[PDB]
Design brief:
Chain M: Keywords: Acetylation, Electron transport, Fatty acid biosynthesis, Fatty acid metabolism, Lipid biosynthesis, Lipid metabolism, Mitochondrion, Phosphopantetheine, Phosphoprotein, Respiratory chain, Transit peptide, Transport. The structure is cut from a larger assembly and holds 13 protein chains of eleven kinds. Chain B is an all-alpha fold and 202 residues long. In chain B, 66% of the residues lie in helices and 0% in strands. In chain B, α1 packs parallel to α4 (93-116). Chain I is 57% helix and 0% strand. Chain L is mostly loops and 15 residues long. Chain L contains no helices and no strands. The chains are: A mainly alpha (115), B mainly alpha (202), C mainly alpha (157), D mainly alpha (178), E mainly alpha (60), G mainly alpha (459), H mainly alpha (171), I mainly alpha (126), J little secondary structure (12), L little secondary structure (15), M mainly alpha (88). Bound molecules: cardiolipin (CDL) (2 copies) and 1,2-Distearoyl-sn-glycerophosphoethanolamine (2 copies). One cardiolipin (CDL) sits between chains G (353-354, 357, 371, 442, 445) and K (19, 22-23, 78). One 1,2-Distearoyl-sn-glycerophosphoethanolamine sits between chains E (16-17, 19-20, 24) and K (9, 12-13, 65-66).
């Protein structure tokens, strides 16, 4: 992408470092923030035998998907709607992460033009 | 391959199966290879990876298409170079049934598996067009480039031993030098320093 | 006792009569008999043949020992146990040793250099880290329950 | 294979073998047959040009320059006929080439299954035992006393005599025994 | 005798292997260990009859 | 044994020996792993190595 | 123990009072039966070792060696029937008597509770061995070989006798049960260091070490097949048994008096395994492989850890079996062509297809192919050393590589390739030598099935 | 057959079948076939064999050794007391190895049944493992291949000396 | 860019000026060599074809090879300042190196062990 | 058409 | 706990039967290539069942068959780990080997 | 069951 | 082993075929015992190509030391027959 041509050259200082995000407090803007809500409880995800990599605020559509896959066997072509919902939620999470990245990038621009 | 020639006309079944194999090896969506290599390319171009590795992996997918096409050309699309007597037979059921079973596999097995397996990881499914379609672009460009290079080597100009091909034709010289420098030292040491000098002499 | 000491190898030949006798013993033309230099390493009168392997022999000639590519009375190179076709090869190459090594090690060094380069200049996505719930799963991952975790909190942006 | 090379290699032979290797490597480069035909006509033109050059000083110099040019622009991976040195099926059947004397240790049970064959074999062995001394003397009596030999064998001059040293050329195991 | 190989090479071996398994490997501790079966909100555990409550309703 | 199916070719035995050699160079690392896990975990089983 | 020794004695009158024709069958059969009788020692249903008297005993360490020694006799007798076929009856009987005396003395040595009986018999095993070598060997180097074999051992053993007598004068008894409960730390001093040297160097020369190993290849090369078998399988194990028994009274001087020997062994392992590549003589190859293998035993015994002793015992048993087997295999082809060079006969898989499987299986046991017990020993020794210092695995691994290399070289250049068509004298394989290889191999399978027997006192 | 208090095995709460389609499950029917065809004749063979066992039934017991003075209660040079004490120590040593093996087995089985959530739900077994391993280390570890009771005793004594000197100090 | 020989990658004898020689002394040498080789070939074939042969064919060149690589060494060995130094290093250099390696590693280990700061959580078997 | 295949003595 | 393991072991039994025959006098008469191909095919069909049961419930086993040797504090057993990896690879390899045999 | 031809293109089986 | 066995008459027919397809030769004056350099007016550089064509035809290679001795096509036939163990 181009996020790399703006960092590795042309003022690296004003582009984000992926390792440190967020590097600004959450209250720097957004006076109030609804801390993200996780539907699924720990016991549900433990009983369903999920992987630590899969419990990322999108585990409830994943649980519905695994339940559908179990009940609809040997009809492995069913459960295609539940796959789409899990993929959608994961896409929204990726969007939120992109948003954090761009937010930090724009905050860096402030420190450049504030000084 | 220089003495194989056209194999469509003279082995249509084997040739179709070989083309299916080469396609599955390449992307060729919805065959067995796709259902893995697609996600491989996506994961590599969508993670905090070394850029050189990413680059040479894409180049190598292109080269995959390239030498797949090299086979398909020098073995399936040119005119004969093999001896004039023909003793060809590919009708024996021992030859056809396993190959066609493996063909059914190469076609449907990736779909079947990838749909029957549980979800292990979380695939990134939101990326620019020029990354989700990048494996296919790569393979297609490789096909085209190899096609052009070969249609060119059909011409009447004289091929030469360019230093960038003698490096490929010869396994990068890795064997040519290692397989006769390391055993030389090993086996000369074992005699001079180990056996005679010490055991038989000192 | 099948072969006599006058048919076995011996001490370094210093008289040209002894050199003739050695080159005859070894079924060698006198002018083509070169004993290893008298360094005191144990060779003696044994011939010193060219350092060529058995690949460079004619592969068509009906050699007596077809696998070694030697003949019955032919002198055996001191290092034949190494210069057999199952082992070291000294055949000529279309490219020269020096050029081969140069190309190979240049390729490898360029690869290492560009790996370090791409490492300093990685390729990531314009995205933030992955936010996991329940304090990044401290109860999971093997965290002491009786002790309370560090409240890392994630927001909805 | 069947013939033994001479002491040294003449100049014409050198040139012919260079011609052969050049045309083969050129076939390897010129994969297509028409391309190969064309560049082979060119190569024959290059050879035939200096064909009536009588001097030898310049002949050997041209030959060495040609050997240099051939070593250069030399196909690293030239075509090699499978059953030939460097080929896929070079000695692939050398593991089934059991010699004949392995039958002198066969068990009479194994033999009773192939009686005619072993009758024929005993006939052959008698033939050999009879011809041995005659061919030995034929050899010892016609060795040039000049002192230099040639490695080639003589034929059976006298009638009723078998050619000397034939039991290993004859009786040679087949080339694809299965 | 269409495919008696099936019997001769599958059924008897299954008999001996089932004997071995069921009466030696089981009947010995920690020989066969199965990752616990998945339980899902809305399922009905069998032995206990327990009913896992369903999930809180999604805002979407 | 399978590469050296034709044991008259001195070029097949070479390849077989080659493979043996390289895969033993790998066996060295495999054995290093076995030793490390036998000393630091006391079991070669995966269920115990996982800790 | 008498029930195993007195039959081995009566074997002698059975050998001499027997008709010239039935002398081999009787002795072979009754030796097999005695090998059977020796299987009661494995009836150990407790941690209390078997003491049969004030003189004879058998622990888990001595029992495997005793059974191996009782089992190798009939195999040696069999192997020793193709040669001696043209020798006079009395010479054959004398050979058989030498072998029986070796069996008896070795069973005694391994059953001995006291170290003076062990020493007397350890030394008595020189007379029959030397006689076998110098009287029935074929070349003239017989005599120099026997000389080396005698005098390395004696120059090593004399200090051992002096040290045993010193221990007697200091403690009151050389019994091994008493010297284990009644023990005292050895104050670190040059006197006690020389005592360590005296107690160890005899065995170290018999294992052998790297620096002193030239007596072994000369002997094996110039020894008839039976002598080679017994030597490789038992007369080296003798030194390891001695070290394992005597290292209890040398604590803790073994902690810092070992580095030289651990080091020599680890390095000579590489040196010898490399020699085994550029070696024209098959017997010399087998001998140098034996040295490479016993180096590990020496190192293991030097670090004296349980895993170490266990691996050492397993490697001793397995190496004995497989080396006897390899020497049998080599002598098989020797009896045809009468040459020890590994380059002359190099296509023997096209004539002896079955005998090649023995070559294959042995060379696989020579290298560490699992689940062979030749491999479990090497593995546990590697582990013990790694725990000792994590930098031993380097040398261990390069030794592994070289081992695979020269074993494959052996079998390739001996069996595989183009047959030597001038070798019209390659008679098919004898049922007897085939039985020999079978008897050497099957016990390896059985041990691999039940390794609990060859572990040792530590387990 | 085998004690739960030694090799505990949780109750395996199993979920009921929730078929949500019209296709048949090829595993339940194959399973009924396998049962009828394999488990029944095998079960019958087993009934017959257990009956033949019930006839001519035989018993066997567990060897109980009494306690005898340890080496602490033995004198330097007294080889009788020392022999008995050392045979005991070897018995107890073998028993402790088998205990550690039992615990390793419990740990393996726990990790396997849990699966992905083994960092949780499998810390009690790992804790018992750590504990018994610390102990085993402190009572059997640095002894050589010639381990005996005197060596364990000397090790215990040096440990107690170091600890008593770390306690006396700082007091 | 013309070929440059090397001790392994040798000269193919077609770029060697010694084959492109018409000198009569060289040709006399070649002829003498062919004569020797043919003499030996006939001496070998008269045995390889002798039907009154029941044993293999003994090769004295091989016997000499082996007698020279094993038994003719020490008599033809005399000590020298190079032989002695190579022997000394080959014998006592790797030993010294590995001694200091092991000694340092084990001293560091045992130091940490007596002191602490080195953990062996589950080492049970050593 | 058929030919004798030479083989060692595999009786023993 | 029974059917799964039964099949996982019967697969090896089937792969072994041809080799135990190869050490018998039958190999003289019977057609060994066809026998081996049939055994591989049947092993594959049998292995299809563990694959189904895993696709269904996603349970994986640990199966200890034979206790080889107990070395002090360290046991050695012939234990099998029938996870996704092992089962799927078994089935795939058996299909491919079935083809290669013909 | 085939007919080995010389320099000619052979006929094919429908299969 | 799917190729029809080789027979002398076929060898001769194919050799004469390859030769008739050589433009520097007249089919009418062609037969076995015919010499390339004397009866058919050829030179060594053409015999080289003749043997090359024999090779490319039968699919194997003939060394130069022997190829140099092949002038009559019957010699070619006999060489190809002694190499491939034909007897009828
Ligand atoms: C060990 C030292 C051996 C040194 C090597 C000596 C040697 O080279 O052997 C002679 C050898 C000469 O060979 P030879 O010419 O065939 O022998 C004929 C001689 O006349 C000498 O033999 P002979 O034919 O004159 O004597 C006939 C006699 C054969 O007896 C002998 O002459 C040789 C006996 C030598 C003693 C070997 C016993 C070894 C015991 C090891 C334990 O036949 C018998 O009747 C055997 C009776 C038993 C003789 C004593 C054997 C030991 C008794 C053991 C108890 C068993 C019986 C109760 O050389
Ligand atoms: C879980 C962990 C489990 C451990 C897994 C082990 C994996 C390691 C694989 C090693 C692979 C080595 C190999 O390539 O095998 C070569 C070998 C091939 O033999 P071949 O090249 O055809 O030689 C045939 C001859 O040319 C001429 O013979 P033929 O063509 O006439 O056919 C007759 C048949 C032989 O027919 C017989 O009569 C054999 C009777 C043997 C009974 C003795 C059994 C021992 C226990 C009885 C108490 O084949 C043989 O000659 C072989 C017999 C000699 C070897 C002795 C049998 C080994 C038994 C091991 C179990 O494989 C076999 O067929 C034998 C069985 C497999 C070898 C396993 C040995 C290691 C055992 C590890 C436990
Ligand atoms: C990160 C870690 C990555 C690891 C990197 C390691 C890089 C080294 C890789 C190569 C090491 C081994 C090189 C030797 C290979 C060899 O020689 O065997 C093949 C050779 C065949 O030669 P070839 O050119 O193929 O001839 C065929 C003709 N068509 O066969 C032969 O000619 C000789 C075969 C028998 C003799 C072999 C030599 C003796 C044994 C040497 C042992 C030590 C070699 C390995 C040392 C490395 C240790 C780390
Ligand atoms: C086939 C070789 C299998 C090797 C693994 C051992 C399994 C066979 C076995 O040992 O069971 C025999 C069983 C008695 O076993 P048990 O009493 O528990 O302990 C024996 C103490 N000496 O005795 C019985 O229960 C009789 C039952 C019939 C015989 C066993 C049925 C075949 C067992 C095959 C299971 C293992 C298959 C996998 C092995 C190959 C894998 C590479």
């Amino acid at each position: 992408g181009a996020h790399l041509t703006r960092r590795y050259l042309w003022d690296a200082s004003v582009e984000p470092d992926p390792e440190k995000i967020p590097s600004f407090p959450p209250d720097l803007g957004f006076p109030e923030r609804k801390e993200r809500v996780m539907v699924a409880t720990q016991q549900e995800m433990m009983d369903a035998q999920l992987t630590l990599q899969q419990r990322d605020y999108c585990a409830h559509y994943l649980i519905r998907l695994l339940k559908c896959k179990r009940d609809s066997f040997p009809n492995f072509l069913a459960c295609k709607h539940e796959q789409h919902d899990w993929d959608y939620c994961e896409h929204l999470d990726y969007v939120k992460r992109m948003k954090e990245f761009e937010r930090e990038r724009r905050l860096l621009q402030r420190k450049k033009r504030r000084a | 391959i220089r003495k194989m020639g056209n194999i469509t006309k003279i082995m249509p079944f084997t040739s179709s199966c070989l083309v299916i194999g080469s396609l599955a090896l390449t992307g060729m969506p919805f065959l067995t290879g796709f259902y893995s290599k697609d996600l491989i390319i996506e994961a590599i171009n969508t993670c905090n990876t070394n850029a050189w590795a990413l680059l040479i992996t894409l180049i190598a997918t292109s080269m995959t298409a390239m030498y797949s096409m090299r086979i398909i050309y020098f073995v399936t699309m040119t005119k004969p170079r093999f001896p004039p007597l023909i003793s060809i037979n590919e009708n024996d059921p021992d030859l056809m049934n396993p190959i066609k079973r493996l063909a059914f596999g190469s076609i449907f097995a990736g779909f079947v598996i990838s749909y029957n397996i549980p979800p292990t990881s979380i695939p990134v499914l939101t990326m620019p067009w020029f990354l989700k379609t990048t494996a296919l672009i790569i393979s297609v460009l490789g096909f085209l480039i190899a096609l052009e290079l070969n249609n060119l080597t059909m011409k009447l100009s004289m091929n030469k031993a360019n230093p960038y091909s003698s490096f490929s034709t010869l396994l990068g010289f890795f064997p040519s030098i290692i397989h006769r420098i390391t055993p030389m030292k090993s086996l000369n040491l074992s005699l001079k320093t180990s056996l005679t000098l010490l055991d038989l002499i000192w | 006792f099948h072969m006599t000491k006058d048919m076995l190898p011996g001490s370094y030949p210093r008289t040209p009569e002894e050199r003739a006798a050695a080159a005859k013993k070894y079924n060698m033309r006198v002018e083509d008999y070169e004993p290893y230099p008298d360094d005191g390493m144990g060779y003696g009168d044994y011939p010193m043949l060219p350092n060529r392997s058995q690949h460079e022999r004619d592969p068509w000639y009906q050699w007596d020992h077809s696998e070694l590519r030697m003949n019955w009375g032919e002198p055996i190179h001191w290092d034949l146990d190494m210069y057999i076709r199952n082992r070291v090869d000294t055949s000529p190459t279309p490219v020269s040793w020096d050029v081969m090594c140069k190309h190979l090690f240049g390729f490898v060094a360029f690869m290492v250099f560009m790996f370090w380069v791409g490492h300093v200049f990685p390729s990531y996505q314009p995205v933030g880290p992955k936010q996991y719930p329940y304090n990044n799963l401290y109860l999971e991952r093997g965290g002491d329950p009786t002790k309370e975790p560090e409240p890392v909190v994630h927001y909805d942006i | 294979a069947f013939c033994a090379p001479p002491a040294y290699l003449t100049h014409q032979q050198k040139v012919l073998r260079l011609y052969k290797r050049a045309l083969r490597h050129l076939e390897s480069w010129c994969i297509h047959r028409d391309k190969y035909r064309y560049f082979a006509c060119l190569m024959r033109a290059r050879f035939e040009e200096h064909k009536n050059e009588k001097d030898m000083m310049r002949a050997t110099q041209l030959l060495r320059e040609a050997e240099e040019e051939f070593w250069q622009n030399q196909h690293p991976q030239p075509y090699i006929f499978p059953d030939s040195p460097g080929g896929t099926s070079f000695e692939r059947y050398e593991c089934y080439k059991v010699p004949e004397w392995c039958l002198d240790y066969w068990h009479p049970s194994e033999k009773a299954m192939y009686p005619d064959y072993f009758s024929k074999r005993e006939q052959w062995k008698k033939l050999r035992m009879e011809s041995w001394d005659r061919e030995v003397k034929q050899l010892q009596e016609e060795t040039s006393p000049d002192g230099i030999m040639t490695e080639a064998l003589p034929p059976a001059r006298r009638e009723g005599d078998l050619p000397p040293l034939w039991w290993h050329i004859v009786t040679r195991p087949r080339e694809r025994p299965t | 005798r269409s495919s008696l190989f099936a019997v001769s090479h599958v059924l008897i071996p299954m008999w001996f292997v089932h004997y071995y398994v069921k009466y030696h490997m089981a009947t010995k501790p920690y020989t066969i260990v199965s990752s616990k079966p998945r339980i899902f909100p809305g399922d009905t555990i069998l032995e206990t009859g327990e009913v896992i409550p369903p999930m809180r309703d999604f805002p979407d | 044994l399978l590469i050296g199916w034709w044991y008259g070719r001195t070029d097949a035995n070479t390849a077989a020996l080659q493979a043996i050699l390289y895969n033993r160079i790998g066996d060295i690392g495999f054995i290093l792993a076995m030793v490390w896990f036998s000393l630091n975990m006391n079991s070669w089983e995966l269920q115990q190595i996982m800790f | 123990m008498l029930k195993i020794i007195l039959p081995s004695l009566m074997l002698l009158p059975l050998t001499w009072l027997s008709s010239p024709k039935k002398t081999w069958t009787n002795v072979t059969s009754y030796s097999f039966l005695i090998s059977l009788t020796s299987l009661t020692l494995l009836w150990q249903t407790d941690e209390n070792y078997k003491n049969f008297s004030n003189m004879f005993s058998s622990d888990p360490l001595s029992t495997p060696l005793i059974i191996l020694t009782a089992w190798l006799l009939p195999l040696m007798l069999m192997a020793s029937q193709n040669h001696l076929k043209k020798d006079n009856n009395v010479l054959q009987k004398l050979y058989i008597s030498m072998l029986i005396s070796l069996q008896i003395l070795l069973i005694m040595t391994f059953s001995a509770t006291e170290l003076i009986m062990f020493y007397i018999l350890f030394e008595a095993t020189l007379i029959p061995t030397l006689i076998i070598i110098t009287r029935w060997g074929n070349q003239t180097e017989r005599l120099n070989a026997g000389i080396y074999f005698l005098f390395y051992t004696l120059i090593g053993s004399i200090p051992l006798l002096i040290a045993l007598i010193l221990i007697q004068n200091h403690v009151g008894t050389l019994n091994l049960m008493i010297l284990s409960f009644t023990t005292h730390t050895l104050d670190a001093s040059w006197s006690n260091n020389l005592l360590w040297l005296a107690c160890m160097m005899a065995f170290l020369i018999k294992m052998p070490l790297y620096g002193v190993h030239l007596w072994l290849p000369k002997a094996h090369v110039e020894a008839p097949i039976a002598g080679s078998m017994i030597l490789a399988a038992i007369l080296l194990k003798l030194g390891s048994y001695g070290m394992i028994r005597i290292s209890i009274i040398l604590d803790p001087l073994t902690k810092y008096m070992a580095y030289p020997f651990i080091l020599l062994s680890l390095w000579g392992m590489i040196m010898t395994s490399s020699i085994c590549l550029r070696q024209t003589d098959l017997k010399s190859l087998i001998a140098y492989s034996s040295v490479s293998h016993m180096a590990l035993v020496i190192a293991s015994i030097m670090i004296q850890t349980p895993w170490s002793f266990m691996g050492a015992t397993m490697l001793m048993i397995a190496h004995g079996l497989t080396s006897s087997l390899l020497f049998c295999l080599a002598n098989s082809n020797y009896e045809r062509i009468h040459s020890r060079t590994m380059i002359m006969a190099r296509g023997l898989q096209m004539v002896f297809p079955l005998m090649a499987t023995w070559w294959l299986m042995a060379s696989l046991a020579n290298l560490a192919l699992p689940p062979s017990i030749n491999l479990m020993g090497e593995l546990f020794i590697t582990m013990s050393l790694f725990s000792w210092s994590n930098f031993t695995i380097i040398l261990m691994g390069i030794n592994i590589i070289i081992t695979g290399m020269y074993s494959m070289y052996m079998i390739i250049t001996t069996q595989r390739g183009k047959l030597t068509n001038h070798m019209i004298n390659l008679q098919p394989s004898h049922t007897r030598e085939l039985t020999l290889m079978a008897l050497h191999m099957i016990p390896l399978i059985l041990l691999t099935t039940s390794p609990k027997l060859i572990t040792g006192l530590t387990m | 057959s085998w004690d739960k208090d030694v090799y505990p095995e949780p109750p395996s709460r199993t979920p009921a079948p929730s078929p949500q389609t019209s296709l048949p499950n090829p595993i339940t029917y194959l399973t009924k076939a396998y049962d009828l065809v394999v488990d029944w004749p095998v079960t019958l063979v087993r009934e017959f064999i257990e009956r033949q066992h019930a006839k001519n039934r035989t018993y066997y017991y567990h060897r109980q050794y009494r306690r005898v003075p340890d080496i602490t209660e033995c004198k330097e040079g007294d080889v009788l007391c020392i022999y008995e004490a050392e045979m005991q120590w070897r018995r107890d040593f073998k028993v402790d190895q088998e205990i550690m093996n039992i615990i390793q087995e419990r740990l393996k089985a726990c990790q396997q049944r849990e699966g992905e959530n083994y960092q949780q739900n499998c810390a009690k077994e790992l804790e018992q493992f750590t504990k018994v391993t610390k102990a085993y280390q402190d009572r059997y570890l640095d002894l050589g291949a010639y381990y005996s009771a005197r060596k364990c005793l000397a090790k215990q004594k040096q440990r107690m000396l170091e600890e008593r000197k770390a306690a006396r100090q700082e007091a | 860019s013309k070929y440059k020989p090397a001790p392994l990658a040798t000269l193919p004898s077609t770029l060697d000026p010694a084959e492109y020689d018409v000198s009569p002394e060289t040709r006399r040498a070649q002829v003498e060599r062919l004569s020797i080789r043919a003499r030996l070939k006939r001496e070998y074939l008269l045995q390889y074809n002798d039907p009154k042969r029941v044993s293999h064919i003994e090769d004295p060149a091989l016997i000499r090879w082996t007698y020279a690589r094993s038994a003719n060494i020490y008599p033809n060995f005399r000590p020298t300042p190079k032989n002695s130094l190579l022997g000394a290093v080959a014998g006592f250099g790797p030993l010294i190196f590995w001694y200091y390696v092991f000694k340092t590693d084990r001293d560091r280990k045992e130091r940490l062990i007596q002191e602490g700061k080195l953990d062996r959580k589950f080492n049970i078997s050593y | 058409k058929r030919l004798f295949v030479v083989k060692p003595s595999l009786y023993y | 706990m029974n059917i799964f393991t039964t099949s996982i072991l019967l697969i090896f039994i089937l792969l072994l039967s041809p080799i135990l025959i190869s050490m018998s006098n039958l190999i003289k008469h019977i057609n060994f290539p066809l026998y081996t191909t049939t055994s591989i095919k049947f092993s594959f069909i049998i292995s299809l069942l563990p694959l189904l049961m895993f696709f269904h419930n996603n349970m994986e086993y640990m199966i200890t068959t034979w206790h080889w040797v107990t070395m002090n504090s360290m046991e050695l057993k012939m234990s099998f780990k029938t996870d996704f990896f092992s089962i799927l690879f078994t089935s795939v390899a058996l299909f491919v080997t079935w083809s290669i045999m013909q | 069951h085939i007919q080995p031809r010389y320099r000619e293109f052979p006929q094919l089986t429908r299969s | 082993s799917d190729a029809p066995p080789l027979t002398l008459d076929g060898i001769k027919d194919r050799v004469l075929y390859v030769l008739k397809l050589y433009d520097k030769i007249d089919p009418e004056k062609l037969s076995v015992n015919s010499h390339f350099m004397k009866d058919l007016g050829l030179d060594s550089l053409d015999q080289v190509e003749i043997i090359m064509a024999m090779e490319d035809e039968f699919g194997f290679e003939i060394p130069d030391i022997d190829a140099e001795k092949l002038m009559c096509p019957q010699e070619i036939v006999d060489y190809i027959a002694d190499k491939k163990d034909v007897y009828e």
